[PDB]
Write an enzyme that holds these catalytic residues in place. Structure first.
Site: not given
Lengths: 228, 206, 239, 245, 238, 245, 200, 213, 113
Positions: G1-2, G17, G169-170
């Site tokens: 999450t970015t 992402d 998480s990305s």
């Protein structure tokens, strides 16, 4: 006098406002329902006379569930509200009991809703009387809902304008022995006895209900039927 | 519980008005996320405001407190919210918000100059409100309040230039000895003429 | 007759009489004109001095509903003032929810529907006043809108409401308001007000001006006084 | 002073709205109930004489309220439906509380309270329905109860509500074996009563809705009489009046 | 030919006119004369107590509201006492929140709104009392008078109640020299204004005049009976 | 409480006439004619067009902001006829309901469902004791995806129906006759045997040729399903196309 | 999450992402985190999926209704304020961090950066989500003023690649969107197209 | 996660003589280990004959003193007289108890003249149990002050000593000296000493200096 | 300080039975506030006033509280005539399953007690 309140019994004790909604129904568009031995036919009379009016949009023989349909004679908007809440009632019953709603129970609930406007003050009774068809474990059902909230079970009846003569016409034309294919034809005859305008393709809307469930007849099938 | 906070607000009285200052940064914890936000309001033509703590709640106050100023200026009678009145209203708002266990996580420093007499008020998240010639919030109360009070106890009445310089020196001290600080701060000065905010001001140190 | 005791009653020919008395109620109040020109909108009212005991400025009819929006009313002072208060709340709500100033065309539609919403119930009665919203912004220029008691909202180049709206409209039709500035329009406004005013019945009025537009940075203001005296004079030698 | 609002006393004491409510009862089908030593019957005139009607199912004016007691209606049939639903619900509620079938007076009074509440605080049409109750309970045995739209009620040994009520009650007063009659002796009496309160039309099983209640083997029985029993009862009374010549 | 339209407040007459409001005005004409002139520094309320009963202490026209706001009632006592409670509540709340005296010119607007609300809804009656509000704030004295029509006016001097037209005429004849008066002369002018309403056979006795003054440094102080001897004495004959 | 049901057959909304006909509803229909404006809507098999008068009885009034064609959603547009305030209120109701439908069901509301929703809402007014029918009739148009071009019309009674071509306003019945003769005769109406049909109807029923300032046209086509209000030039272009022969 | 957004001259370029983790397992790996609020206005969702999705749907409801009422395209600041209200009244019950960005006729390309909490602040470039911590320094060092559309796209792709290679998480594919006056020109950078930086 | 309360410190003391009622308090506002200000008096004037002094959480002190002033004005409006001291005390007990489940973290002492002009002092608790005492002290330093007052005013634990009535001058001397002593050992007390002297001639205020550290 | 009605107190209860107690029990009013804020903010004050103004006169006359009610017109005024939820199937008011004395329940509706 006394014809103003809907909550004032006459000195003769008869509710004049509901007395009037009956006149509104009797001033509506004729409808006929017949119980054949294996099914029920509902046929109604279309006021969408001008060619600009469409059939693809508004319908009168309008379904409730896989096996219950209505037809009315009265005020169209009041119909639409009533059919909306009948659909509510059927789905409520189906959620509570995993069972398609019996026709009689739907009639009773809708009649209770209709009566709930007869005694409230500050509202008016519905200006429509409903004819309800259904099919529950192997026997047809036909009910008529009075605006007062009363409901009746009819083997065959006519309603809307010129109904008393349609009631008499069904008398020496109906019996146990008639069945659905002939019921369609006799209902058509009952309608044209007072159609006043010599029907064609979509001057009428017809619905049927056998164990295949409630089904509205497409105009081609009605055309097939008007051939005889 | 707050998420994006501001560190410290300084303010010192002086002869003719009130000068307050606050750096421009919002910390998302230990992180300097936003580096150009402003934490100084001009309430009306006599009162400014600064605040530390949650910045979203400060923006909510900007929405509300700003709105009352318009709501009265449209009336056009001429009465205006005096600085003491804004301080009292803010005190009441945050005390009420605390009593419902949903506090406005902030510690403002209302400063204003009306009727020839300066004014400096402090309100925190718990409704602790008072007045003092010099204020400080956060680690300003440990690192800048001592210098301000030392200077004030010797000379009780300050000119504009001495007050601004004193605030600048205290800001240097905070920048050196406070983790959640930035070297770009704003100074807001009120006199009879009106609110005046200069910024951004750096700190060119040796 | 008989069909005119409540707003929830249609006359046999299809006319809600108890909103047409309200539109006929405003003809009891003195006139109010507002003209739109290149830079902004300027108002002006035949404000009646009921008695000399009143302060210069009682019974104002030129309320400010927001920074950039004005209002001139005609009819019941109480109901018009209440509507001015209601509009003051629409602008505040719009600012609080969307950050920027409320567009005039949107505000005139927020309030017109409110006046209308009181015109279809038996419990409440329709508002007995009409009013003009004026504003200016560089994005959209100057706008002027009028709201009759029935709730109909239309935008106008020149408007006039009161007991002599007809003469006022006739005289307004004589200006090229699309090609003028407020500085030159205030003089014409005073001229119209004195021309339309009927002195025989209504001695001792107080001409009351206001403009908002480019020359005031788009902020609604009562006219600075010296301009009011120059317009007063200008209307006087012309008469 | 006059006929309005269901909450005004006329300047003479009489609630005119309720007096008019007890007028619609004088038009519905005749309904009578008779109390016997060993059972209770509840006969009624089914005025839906039209031949196209169907669904003779158990009732058109004879409803069952719980395991023990049954009901009959007269008047505006929709309000009767509402009242019968309310009765069933009240009976089930009492059973839920005390885990015993509700005594008949309990339910009769519970309903009369509602029916009176509509002839008081309101602004709404009072329920224009007059009922009859038949039932059993351990406290008094067989019971019969009447009700008016006024909310009044009373236990009756033998009564009748609806069309031709006056003549029926007069004949019942002059005709009753009070306290010492069996069941179908009272059935013959009821047939005689209905034969008194005919229209021009002579009655037949297509125009009658007799139902009976019985105390047997610890369980209460409400069986609506079928075709054959009713026609046989009719022939019986017919011969009896024939030889009465 | 307007009997159908003059019963409810939510019914416009077929002349663009609410008769009920105009009938609510007629309550003000049933009170008693009261005068509210003002000077550059002070504001006063001279009112004439009702001599309609006997042997019983007269009614209480002048009402304390706050340290800087006072009122004089000339209408239904019920509505007057109902509005004074709301006024006190507003002033108390203003001092509670902002810790400042509530400005008069905003309290009057609040009155206007609150009295307008019933004028439009069914099953309510307009507040049948006319006020006379004397107050001092950052902008010196003010005299506001309220009507049952929810319409408030800013007045340099006004009189409301029975026969108040005489007082209004007198004040109109002497309004110019009101701004520059010491307290004594201001009260004497107000007493004279109240006097020009009464029948010539009776004079303003100490038992039916209720001067109440507010100003720069004087709080709103009500002067009841005999205490009004200093103001009333020295008053020349008509 | 409320003022009370005005006593009379035609005094009030819910009261019924002796032969069962609501009157205030029909007076609401005859309230459409207030204003004098009339509107016409027709559809080909790939376009739907609404045309109405633009009568501005003054020159001070900003002609740009006076209008009767409102855009409900991007694919649905309406023309209102009748009392203006109620018309605009019903436009607000339509916009809110259409946005809410998309929010709750995730796709653009079909024209039929919108017209049905608003007919339902408007009928409710014909049943309570102080709400009043809005003296304004709506004419929606749009393309859903496949059902085809659709033109619907509400009314204060709560009725709605499908139209190949409809009209509303004062000169409505004659417009209906002309339009019926139109549809009887020839019904391609691609885009041109369209709007020339609507403008010709409006003129021939109303008066001599219009000039572009008095006409307000909105169109939706199958390959351009967004409500576009035609500008003063292209309307004038169609006008000369009437003249140009 | 970015999620990431940059304002260039005349418009805005978004970036995100596609990876929705439910712990250490990748529940969805081609998630479209660029929800279109309006025709030319976008949001980027970070945090709990349900809260951001519901907030975006509510905001697109309110904003569509508002745009219809005003008969104009909405200002980006209006959508930012609408997000701020919902994210601030329910700040306790929500875990949403939104990067509202778009274009409008008045103020040109705008990037507002409503974080978790209810702030609303304008940024020349705004980044968020879990992985943004690993590219704060890169964006601080490389961002310049007056960048064109193309080099803005390259900058966004580089920053997202740097984040996804580092944060767990990305990852996945990079979804871009170049909002301008004409209209959105979406693209997806997948597999080889993602910039790669030589590991030691 | 949010402490709805915080202790700001501050000491109060009251003495009830025959013609007077001393109410005195330090003026240091503290929090944790910091001095917010040195000139925040904790005695408020309610009526020409009654003075309240609150100590503890400062937010509740402000709210309570404003509620009390509002309630005096409401009483004056409804009943048409200024409240007596006992009536104010009873009201304060009721007000404090209304927040029994969210208490006002304040210690209050009412000092003033009763109906007959003799001195009277009422001492409260955070939920409103009030009582009449001849003298009292509350707040942070109350434990330091009360024994000394018991000794010097109530003459407790002394034998064969003349019970002289307490004079106003000796009362001032005693209060000043007890706060001089208290400022030495209690960290929350100092920086000034506002003393209110409630007599039949009004309320006159004296303020002296303490240790500034 | 009384009873014969279950000592109406619940003071011990106070705190909700669940974060889903008060919110789920009164989501009807919660949704009313949601839609009104949606309409106050964007549509106006007239629309919430209309909704309040109507919802008042759909409830004034339906039936007396001690009897079951359907509340038809209210349902097709809100979208509920085609949206049916968990409040319609679980413990319907038709079988309310707990009732008091009729009178005593019809008075409080207006608020005598």
């Amino acid at each position: 006098g006394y014809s103003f309140s809907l909550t004032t019994f006459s000195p003769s004790g008869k509710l004049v406002q509901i007395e009037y909604a009956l006149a509104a129904v009797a001033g509506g568009a004729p409808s006929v329902g017949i119980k054949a031995a294996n099914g029920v036919v509902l046929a109604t009379e279309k006021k969408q006379k001008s060619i600009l009016y469409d059939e693809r949009s508004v319908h009168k023989v309008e379904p409730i569930t896989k096996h219950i349909g209505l037809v009315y004679s009265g005020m169209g908007p009041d119909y639409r509200v009533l059919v909306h809440r009948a659909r509510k009632l059927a789905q409520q019953y189906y959620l509570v009991y995993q069972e398609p709603i019996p026709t009689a129970q739907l009639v009773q609930r809708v009649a209770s809703v209709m009566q709930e406007y007869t005694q409230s003050g500050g509202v008016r009774p519905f200006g429509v009387s409903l004819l309800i068809c259904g099919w529950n474990e192997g026997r047809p059902y036909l009910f008529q809902s009075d605006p007062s909230g009363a409901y009746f079970a009819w083997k065959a009846t006519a309603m809307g304008k010129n109904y008393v003569n349609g009631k008499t016409f069904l008398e020496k034309r109906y019996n146990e022995d008639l069945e659905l294919e002939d019921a369609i034809h006799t209902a058509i005859l009952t309608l044209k006895e007072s159609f006043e305008g010599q029907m064609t393709e979509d001057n009428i809307e017809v619905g049927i209900c056998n164990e295949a469930g409630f089904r509205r007849l497409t105009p081609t099938e009605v055309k097939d039927y008007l051939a005889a | 519980n707050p998420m994006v906070t501001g560190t410290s607000v300084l303010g010192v009285k002086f002869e003719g008005g009130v000068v307050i200052a606050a750096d421009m940064l919002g910390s998302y914890g230990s992180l300097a996320r936003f580096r150009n936000i402003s934490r100084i309001m001009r309430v009306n033509n006599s009162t400014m405001l600064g605040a530390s703590g949650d910045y979203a709640d400060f923006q909510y106050l900007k929405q509300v407190l700003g709105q009352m100023v318009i709501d009265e200026e449209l009336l056009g009678d001429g009465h205006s919210y005096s600085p003491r009145a804004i301080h009292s209203w803010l005190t009441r708002a945050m005390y009420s918000r605390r009593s419902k266990m949903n506090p406005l996580w902030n510690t403002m420093v209302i400063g204003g100059y009306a009727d020839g007499e300066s004014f400096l008020g402090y309100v925190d998240m718990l409704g602790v409100a008072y007045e003092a010639p010099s204020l400080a919030t956060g680690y300003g109360a440990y690192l800048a309040q001592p210098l301000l009070r030392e200077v004030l106890e010797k000379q009780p009445v300050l000119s504009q230039t001495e007050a601004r310089d004193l605030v600048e020196r205290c800001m240097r001290v905070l920048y050196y000895r406070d983790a959640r600080s930035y070297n770009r701060f704003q100074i807001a000065t009120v006199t009879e003429k009106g609110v005046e905010i200069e910024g951004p001001l750096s700190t060119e140190t040796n | 007759t008989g069909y005119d005791l409540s707003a929830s009653t249609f006359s046999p020919d299809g006319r809600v009489f108890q909103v047409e008395y309200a539109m006929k109620a405003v003809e009891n109040s003195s006139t109010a004109i507002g003209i739109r020109c290149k830079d902004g909108v300027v108002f002006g009212v035949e404000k009646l001095v009921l008695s000399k005991l009143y302060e210069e400025g009682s019974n104002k009819r030129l309320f400010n509903v927001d920074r950039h929006v004005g209002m001139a009313v005609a009819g019941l002072l109480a109901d018009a003032r209440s509507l001015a208060d209601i509009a003051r709340e629409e602008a505040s709500n719009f600012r609080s929810n969307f950050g920027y100033n409320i567009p005039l065309k949107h505000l005139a539609d927020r309030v017109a529907m409110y006046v209308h919403a009181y015109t279809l119930y038996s419990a409440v009665r329709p508002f007995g006043c009409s009013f003009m919203l004026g504003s200016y912004s560089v994005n959209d220029g100057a706008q002027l809108y009028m709201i009759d008691p029935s709730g109909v909202s239309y935008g106008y180049w020149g408007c006039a409401i009161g007991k002599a709206r007809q003469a006022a409209k006739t005289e307004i039709e004589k200006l090229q308001m699309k090609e003028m500035t407020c500085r030159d329009i205030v003089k014409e406004v005073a001229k119209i007000i004195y021309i339309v005013h009927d002195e025989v019945k209504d001695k001792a009025f107080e001409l009351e001006l206001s403009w908002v537009g480019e020359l005031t940075n788009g902020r609604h203001e009562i006219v600075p006084k010296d301009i009011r005296e120059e317009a007063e004079k200008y209307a006087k030698e012309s008469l | 002073r006059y006929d309005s609002r269901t909450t005004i006393f006329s300047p003479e004491g009489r609630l005119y709205q309720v007096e008019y409510a007890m007028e619609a009862i004088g038009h519905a089908g005749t309904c009578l109930g008779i109390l016997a030593n060993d059972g209770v019957l509840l006969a009624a005139e089914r005025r839906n004489i039209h031949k196209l009607l169907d669904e003779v199912f158990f009732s058109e004016k004879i409803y069952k309220l719980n395991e023990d007691m049954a009901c009959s209606v007269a008047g505006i049939t929709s309000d009767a439906n509402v009242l019968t639903n309310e009765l069933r619900l009240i009976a089930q509620r009492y059973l839920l509380q005390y885990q015993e079938p509700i005594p008949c007076e309990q339910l009769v009074t519970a309903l009369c309270d509602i029916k009176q509440a509509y002839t008081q605080f309101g602004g709404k049409r009072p329920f224009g329905v007059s009922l009859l109750y038949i039932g059993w309970d351990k406290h008094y045995g067989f019971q019969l109860y009447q009700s008016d739209p006024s909310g009044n009620y009373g236990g009756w040994k033998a009564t009748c509500i609806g069309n031709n009520s006056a003549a029926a009650v007069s004949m019942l007063k002059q005709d009753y074996k009070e306290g010492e009659m069996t069941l179908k002796s009272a059935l013959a009496l009821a047939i005689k009563v209905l034969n008194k309160t005919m229209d021009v039309s002579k009655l037949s099983a297509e125009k009658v809705e007799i139902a009976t209640l019985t105390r047997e083997n610890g369980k209460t029985v409400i069986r609506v009489l079928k075709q054959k029993e009713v026609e046989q009862l009719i022939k019986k009374h017919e011969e009896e009046e024939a030889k009465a010549e | 030919f307007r009997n159908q339209y003059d019963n409810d407040v939510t019914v416009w007459s077929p002349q663009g006119r609410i008769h009920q409001i105009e009938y609510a005005m007629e309550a003000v004409k049933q009170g008693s004369a009261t005068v509210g002139l003002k000077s550059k520094t002070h504001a006063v309320l001279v009112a004439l107590k009702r001599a309609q009963s006997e042997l019983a202490a007269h009614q209480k026209k002048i009402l304390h509201v706050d340290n800087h706001i006072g009122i004089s009632i000339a209408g239904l006592t019920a509505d007057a006492r109902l509005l004074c409670n709301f006024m006190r509540q507003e002033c108390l709340d203003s001092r509670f929140v902002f810790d400042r005296p509530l400005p008069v010119s905003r309290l009057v607007s609040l009155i206007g709104s609150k009295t307008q609300i019933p004028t439009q809804r069914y099953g309510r009656r307009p507040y049948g009392v006319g006020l006379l509000i004397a107050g001092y704030d950052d902008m010196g004295p003010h005299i506001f008078q309220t009507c049952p029509s929810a319409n408030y006016f800013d007045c340099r001097a006004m009189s409301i109640g029975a026969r108040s037209q005489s007082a209004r005429t007198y004040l109109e004849r002497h309004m110019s020299e009101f701004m520059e008066c010491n307290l004594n002369e201001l009260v004497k002018h107000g007493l004279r204004a109240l006097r020009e309403t009464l029948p010539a056979e009776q004079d303003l006795t100490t038992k039916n005049v209720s001067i109440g003054i507010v100003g720069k440094d004087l709080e709103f102080t009500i002067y009841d009976d005999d205490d009004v001897s200093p103001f009333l004495e020295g008053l020349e004959e008509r | 409480m409320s003022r009370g049901s005005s006593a009379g057959f035609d005094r009030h909304i819910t009261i019924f006439s002796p032969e069962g006909r609501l009157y205030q509803v029909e007076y609401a229909f005859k309230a459409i004619n207030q204003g004098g404006l009339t509107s016409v809507a027709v559809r080909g098999k790939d376009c739907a067009v609404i045309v109405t008068q633009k009568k501005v009885p003054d020159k001070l009034l900003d002609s740009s902001t006076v209008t009767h064609l409102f855009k409900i959603t991007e694919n649905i547009g309406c023309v209102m006829t009748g009392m203006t305030a109620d018309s605009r209120s019903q436009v607000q109701r339509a916009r809110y309901e259409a946005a809410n439908w998309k929010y709750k069901y995730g796709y653009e509301i079909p024209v039929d469902m919108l017209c049905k929703r608003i007919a339902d809402i408007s009928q409710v007014y014909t049943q309570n004791a102080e709400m009043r029918p809005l003296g304004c009739c709506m004419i929606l148009i749009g393309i859903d995806e496949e059902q085809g071009p659709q033109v619907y019309k509400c009314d204060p009674a709560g009725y709605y129906c499908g139209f190949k071509a409809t009209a509303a306003g004062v000169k409505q019945t004659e417009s209906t006759s002309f339009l019926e003769k139109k549809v009887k005769k020839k019904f391609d109406w691609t885009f041109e045997q369209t709007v020339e049909t609507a403008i010709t109807c409006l003129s021939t029923v109303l008066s001599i040729d219009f000039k572009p300032s008095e006409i307000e046209v909105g169109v939706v086509t199958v390959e351009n399903p967004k409500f576009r209000i035609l500008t003063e030039a292209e309307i004038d272009a169609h006008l000369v196309a009437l003249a140009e022969r | 999450t970015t999620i990431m957004a940059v304002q260039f001259d005349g418009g805005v370029v978004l970036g995100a992402d596609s990876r929705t983790t439910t712990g250490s397992y990748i529940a969805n790996r081609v998630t479209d985190k660029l929800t279109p609020i309006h025709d030319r206005i976008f949001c980027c969702r970070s945090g709990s999926a349900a809260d951001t999705q519901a907030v975006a749907d509510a905001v697109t409801y309110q904003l569509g209704f508002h745009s219809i009422e005003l008969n104009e395209p909405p200002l980006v600041h209006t959508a930012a304020s609408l997000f701020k209200e919902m994210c601030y009244r329910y700040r306790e019950d929500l875990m949403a961090g939104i990067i509202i960005a778009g274009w409008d006729p008045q103020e040109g390309g705008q990037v507002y950066s409503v974080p978790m909490g209810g702030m609303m602040v304008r940024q020349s470039f705004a980044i968020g989500g879990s992985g943004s911590s690993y590219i704060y320094g890169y964006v601080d060092a490389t961002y310049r003023e007056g960048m064109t559309k193309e080099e803005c796209l390259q900058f966004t792709a580089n920053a997202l690649a740097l984040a996804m290679e580092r944060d767990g998480s990305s990852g996945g594919v990079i979804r871009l969107a170049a909002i301008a006056e004409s209209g959105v020109e979406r693209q997806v950078l997948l597999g080889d197209q993602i910039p790669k930086f030589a590991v030691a | 996660r949010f402490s709805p309360y915080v202790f700001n410190g501050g000491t109060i003391l009251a003495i009830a003589g025959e013609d007077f009622a001393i109410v005195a308090s330090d003026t240091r506002l503290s929090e944790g280990f910091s001095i917010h200000t040195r000139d925040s008096p904790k005695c408020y004037k309610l009526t020409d004959k009654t003075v309240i002094g609150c100590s503890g959480f400062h937010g509740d002190c402000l709210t309570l003193t404003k509620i009390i002033e509002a309630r005096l004005k409401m009483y004056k409006h409804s009943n048409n007289k200024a409240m007596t001291t006992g009536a104010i005390a009873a009201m304060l007990s009721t007000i404090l108890y209304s927040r029994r489940f969210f208490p006002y973290y304040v210690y209050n002492i009412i000092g003033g003249l009763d109906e007959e002009g003799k001195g009277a002092v009422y001492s409260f608790d955070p939920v409103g149990s009030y009582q009449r005492d001849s003298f009292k002290a509350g707040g942070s330093a109350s434990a330091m002050l009360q024994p000394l007052l018991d000794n010097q005013v109530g003459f407790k634990n002394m034998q064969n000593v003349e019970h002289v009535p307490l004079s106003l001058d000796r009362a001032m001397r005693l209060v000043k000296d007890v706060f001089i002593s208290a400022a030495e050992r209690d960290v929350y007390t100092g920086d000034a000493l506002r003393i209110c002297i409630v007599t039949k001639e009004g309320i006159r205020e004296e303020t002296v200096s303490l240790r500034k550290d | 300080d009384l009873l014969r009605k279950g000592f109406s107190c619940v003071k011990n209860e106070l705190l909700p039975s669940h974060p889903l107690e008060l919110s789920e029990k009164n989501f009807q009013l919660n949704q009313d506030k949601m839609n009104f804020s949606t309409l106050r903010n964007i549509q106006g004050l007239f629309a919430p006033l209309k909704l309040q103004m109507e919802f008042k006169a759909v409830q004034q006359v339906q039936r007396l509280p001690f009897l079951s009610s359907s509340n038809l017109s209210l349902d097709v005024l809100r979208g509920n005539d085609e949206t049916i939820g968990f409040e319609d199937i679980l413990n319907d008011p038709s079988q309310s399953e707990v009732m008091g004395e009729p009178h005593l329940m019809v008075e409080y509706k207006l608020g005598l007690l």
